[PDB]
Design a protein around this ligand. Structure first.
Ligand SMILES: [Mn+2]
Ligand SMILES: [Mn+2]
Length: 391
């Protein structure tokens, strides 16, 4: 081991400019950070800048430094998707030719009519919403009419909510299994169908622990599996566990927000492990990119950066911090979908005594997993070139 512990931080959707193949994704002219910096009239990110963010690309408020703390570069995506699952799966060593649909605004009618025709039920909703907001909005119409409440979040999830006194649990699961088979289709690929039973009465509904999830496991063995199987530690913080459907996860830390995520990261800097601590910061995407809010997005970027000194304070000489993104989601770019963009890569360790340097442009996100695996001496991923030897 060159490093005892590796802290990997995905800043969900924080893209650094349109990818060479953006045209194929309708993302011509996309620039997540750059457009935010323009809207912000200068972005304030002194710590990322210190790590070398501006040395990768110079943007409003983000200028390059003379002696960066870490190593720096951009990564190009190889997989044919720009969704969260595709990104994370690539990062951990896989190549995806069948990508997932994000469905940021809900589902096409033909999929839902097929599910009506297959279930004997009618469907209401079909909108992006939080669990409790849709139950407040449509929970009573569910009870009275017997319709299925079908909704989504920002990412590749199809949720079906129904009252346990109106749709028995067994009928609900049966319906989700149908839905899961129907969305096992490249045109309708969802990553997770979720059964969302609720009880209570109108104006006072509660989701129950009878939630079941129909998720797709990563298309292959990830670097996470290789770590877990050689008895390393794989700590999953935030959506990470969901994203990889538990594959290769040894411990799991749920989080309610970007700040809560950073708090959990600091907790892990405070535990004895050997392996990988792996955090997703999802708010940039869920709260800001999909709501096309570049101001709140700038504010969250600055807020996140303000947490980095706390991280710097806990890093040991044999720790490596890696900071990246899994796609873009430019809040100025048309519509609410993700954007096909390069993602930044920063690599810092306090054992980089005379600072870092520009890494060659990473050809696949899988270069991260390759680096993680070369470090711990487990099975190398099928795709990806390790950059550990440059560090
Ligand atoms: Mn994402
Ligand atoms: Mn998203």
């Amino acid at each position: 081991n060159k490093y005892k512990r590796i802290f990997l931080v995905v800043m969900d959707s924080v893209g650094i400019g349109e990818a060479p193949d953006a045209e194929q994704f309708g993302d011509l002219g996309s620039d997540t950070i750059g457009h935010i910096a323009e809207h912000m009239n200068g972005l304030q990110m002194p710590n990322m800048v210190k790590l070398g963010l501006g040395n990768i690309r110079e943007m409003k408020g983000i200028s390059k430094v003379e002696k960066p703390l870490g190593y720096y570069t951009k990564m190009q995506e190889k997989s044919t998707g720009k969704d969260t699952m595709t990104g994370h799966w690539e990062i951990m060593g896989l190549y995806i030719d069948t990508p997932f649909q994000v469905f940021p605004e809900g589902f096409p009618k033909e999929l839902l009519d097929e599910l009506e025709e297959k279930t004997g039920r009618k469907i209401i909703g079909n909108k992006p919403a939080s669990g409790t907001e849709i139950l407040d909005e449509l929970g009573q119409e569910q009870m009275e009419t017997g319709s299925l409440i079908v909704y989504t979040s920002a990412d590749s999830v199809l949720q079906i909510a129904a009252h346990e006194e109106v749709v028995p649990l067994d009928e609900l699961y049966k319906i989700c299994k149908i839905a899961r088979e129907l969305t096992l289709d490249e045109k309708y690929m969802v990553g997770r169908v979720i059964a969302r039973p609720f009880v209570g009465e109108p104006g006072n509904f509660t989701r129950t622990p009878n939630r079941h999830d129909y998720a797709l496991k990563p298309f292959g063995r990830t670097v996470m599996n290789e770590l877990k199987d050689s008895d390393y530690d794989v700590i999953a913080i935030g959506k990470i566990s969901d994203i990889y459907d538990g594959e290769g996860v040894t411990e799991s830390l749920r989080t309610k927000s970007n700040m809560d995520g950073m708090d959990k990261l600091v907790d892990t800097l405070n535990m004895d492990f050997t392996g990988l601590s792996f955090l997703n910061l999802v708010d940039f995407d869920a709260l800001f990119g999909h709501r096309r809010d570049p101001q709140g997005y700038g504010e969250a970027l600055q807020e996140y950066d303000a947490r980095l000194p706390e991280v710097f304070a806990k890093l040991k000489e044999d720790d490596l911090l890696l900071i990246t993104a899994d796609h873009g989601n430019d809040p100025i770019h048309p519509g609410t979908d993700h954007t096909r963009e390069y993602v930044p890569l920063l690599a810092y360790s306090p054992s980089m005594k005379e600072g870092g340097q520009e890494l060659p442009l990473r050809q696949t996100f899988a270069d991260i997993g390759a680096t993680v695996a070369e470090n711990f001496g487990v099975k190398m991923p099928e795709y990806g070139t390790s950059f550990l030897n440059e560090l």
